[PDB]
Structure formats: structure tokens, C-alpha cells
Design an enzyme around this catalytic site. Sequence first.
Site, PDB file in Angstrom:
ATOM      1  N   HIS A  27     -25.077 -22.425  12.745  1.00 30.13           N
ATOM      2  CA  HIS A  27     -23.597 -22.311  12.623  1.00 30.13           C
ATOM      3  C   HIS A  27     -22.956 -23.476  11.836  1.00 30.13           C
ATOM      4  O   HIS A  27     -21.779 -23.331  11.530  1.00 30.13           O
ATOM      5  CB  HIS A  27     -22.907 -22.050  13.985  1.00 30.13           C
ATOM      6  N   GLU A  51     -30.113 -19.774  16.254  1.00 30.18           N
ATOM      7  CA  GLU A  51     -29.360 -21.033  15.980  1.00 30.18           C
ATOM      8  C   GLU A  51     -30.280 -22.122  15.386  1.00 30.18           C
ATOM      9  O   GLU A  51     -29.772 -23.173  15.083  1.00 30.18           O
ATOM     10  CB  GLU A  51     -28.614 -21.489  17.237  1.00 30.18           C
ATOM     11  N   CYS A 136     -23.240 -30.958  16.677  1.00 33.32           N
ATOM     12  CA  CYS A 136     -24.241 -29.889  16.507  1.00 33.32           C
ATOM     13  C   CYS A 136     -25.147 -30.181  15.300  1.00 33.32           C
ATOM     14  O   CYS A 136     -24.653 -30.653  14.255  1.00 33.32           O
ATOM     15  CB  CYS A 136     -23.584 -28.517  16.408  1.00 33.32           C
TER      16      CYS A 136
END
Lengths: 170, 172
Positions: A27, A51, A136
Site C-alpha cells: 500500500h 501486503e 509502514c
Amino acid sequence: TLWSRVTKFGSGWGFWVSPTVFITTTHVIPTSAKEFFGEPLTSIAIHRAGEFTLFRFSKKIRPDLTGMILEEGCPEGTVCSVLIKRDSGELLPLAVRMGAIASMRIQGRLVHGQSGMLLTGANAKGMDLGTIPGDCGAPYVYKRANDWVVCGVHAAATKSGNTVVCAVQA
Amino acid sequence: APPTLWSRVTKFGSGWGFWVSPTVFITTTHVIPTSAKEFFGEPLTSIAIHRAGEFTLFRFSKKIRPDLTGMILEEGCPEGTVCSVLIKRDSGELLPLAVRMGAIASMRIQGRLVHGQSGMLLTGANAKGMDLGTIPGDCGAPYVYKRANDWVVCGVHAAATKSGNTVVCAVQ
Ligand SMILES: Cc1ccc(CNc2cccc(C(=O)O)c2)s1
């Protein structure tokens, strides 16, 4: 140092496993690009598994680095370190006790990866004791025999910033 | 950790010290250069020194850091408090290492006798090496924590076990 492998990328971070191999959280990757780190997207292999995303470049982007062990998560009970870099210039290694692979509901979304809980626990009310959304793509690492093992990338965290998901290869 | 706390961390001797106020500077006793007779342009004769084992406090007779406000210095912290050790590393890299604080302890660390508040790093399974743990050059780095609405300093980095997670904070 492990820390020179952690690189700002898209809306988060990534990690140089070797001179030609970069791993990140799917993402955070730009959705509009013709090149990364000066190489045309034309010449880059992209391997995506939910992911987790791995890039393989066709020339040495980080020839100062040796290749590291990458594995599909780690045994339950391993205490990993998440190697967080902040735009402030702070480096924040945090201990994470790892559990099973699962599909978990995290702030209203389903995320598949290795579950973890921070040893800072109870809370943070303190950005230096927990994760924030900008983190992230930060890597999960641990020492085993003489070697550092990388076993995935930071994909998501609950509102406390203390239950986390590590996205893993394959 | 807030920029006003990183601004107080000063390279000093073989390690670091910390400005508590415009006139008060704390450090670890063994990092002080033993020949030194002058600090921040002041002669020794115009400085009050308070020393307890590995803890040293310098009080100056003029404002050395007038950009700063005085903050709270306490004699260690409650058992169970999670602190950050404010460590500066090669290249404007800032390393706020998380530590769970425990009991007042006396220990033998790499052969040397040390006394202060013990703690366990919360950075990995064990903190051997410079990516997850402390090094001799980190000595005098402050232990800080946030209360209610503010930040406290409760000591300075004195020692750590080479293969382990245990640190000692020297205290006033
Ligand atoms: C040669 C070493 C590499 C890293 C060491 C552990 N850290 C540490 C920090 C601060 C003081 C001390 C001490 O033994 O005084 C040790 S020891």
C-alpha cells in the site's frame, strides 16, 4: 549497519536485502511511476503477495551492501525488532513478540500477515513507544546464530499502536 | 522525543551530558576529562560540583544556556516506568532507546563495580551490538519519561552488560 538499509519510499519505507533486492509494504508504493531509484520500471521485476512486495533490479543499486537472509516470517515466541525510521531523524528499534499468521481486522480492514505484540505494551501516549501509520514498510529482523534474518515488513497496527501485523513473503 | 530535550544533549569528554537548566549540567562521572580546569569558558573555582558515585552535577555562576527553561530532575523513577535513553549516533541520527526501569542495584559490569537504577531494554531479544543496544561512547546520555503533561529527567547512562539487555542509570 542494518539502519543504512532502511530507505524512505512512497508513503512509508522499504529495506535493502541485497544490492539488487528491495522489500516494502504494497500500500505505500507509488501508483504513478516510470522509474525507481533511477532505474526504468521497464527493467524491474515486481513480486507481490498481498501486503508484501519484493523488487529485483537489473543492476547493483546498493553495491556497498552484502546480501541478507530473507525468510517467510519466524517461529512463534521469537522477539523481533521493528526498525522504525521517523521524518524527525529518530531511529526507533522496538521489540515485538511474534504469534501466528492470520487474517486480522485492524481499524476496519482485513490484513493478512504474522501477528505481533510490542513489549512496551499497556500503551504509548508517546510516539516513541509505539508505531504510527507513516511507519509502514519498516522491516522485522532478529539475530539467529551469527546472522540477522529479515522476516517481513510493517503492514498495520491497532489504534494503541501495540498489536501489529508483519506482511510476509509467499 | 521533543526537540527541546535533544537540544540539551551535549557532546562531553568520552561521552555526553545534559542541560537541566541554563546553569545546571549533569553527566556520568567517568566521562569527565580528569585534567580539565575550564568548562564552557568558566574556571573550576566558579563552579559548584555535586558528585555521588557515577552521577555528577555541575552548577555554574552564570547562564551558559539561556535558550533553555529549567525542567524537573528526580532521583530515578518508580519501578515499571518506561523511559527513553536519548542517544546521538554517527550523522545527526537520534536513537531514543526504550527501557523498562527496575530496582536500585549494585552490579559488576565487564569487571567494574557500578551502582544505580537498573533497567531492561525493550529493543529486541537481546541488545548486543550498536543497532539495538548501547556502547561505551553513549555514557552520560539522559533517561527521560513523559508524565501527565510534561517530561522528567531521572538520570544518566552509566553502564550496560555486553551480551544482554540490562542498563544502569546513575541517579542524584
Ligand atoms: C566494548 C563494549 C561494547 C558494547 C558494550 C555494552 N555497552 C556499554 C555501554 C556503556 C558502558 C559500558 C561499560 O562496560 O562501561 C558498556 S561493552
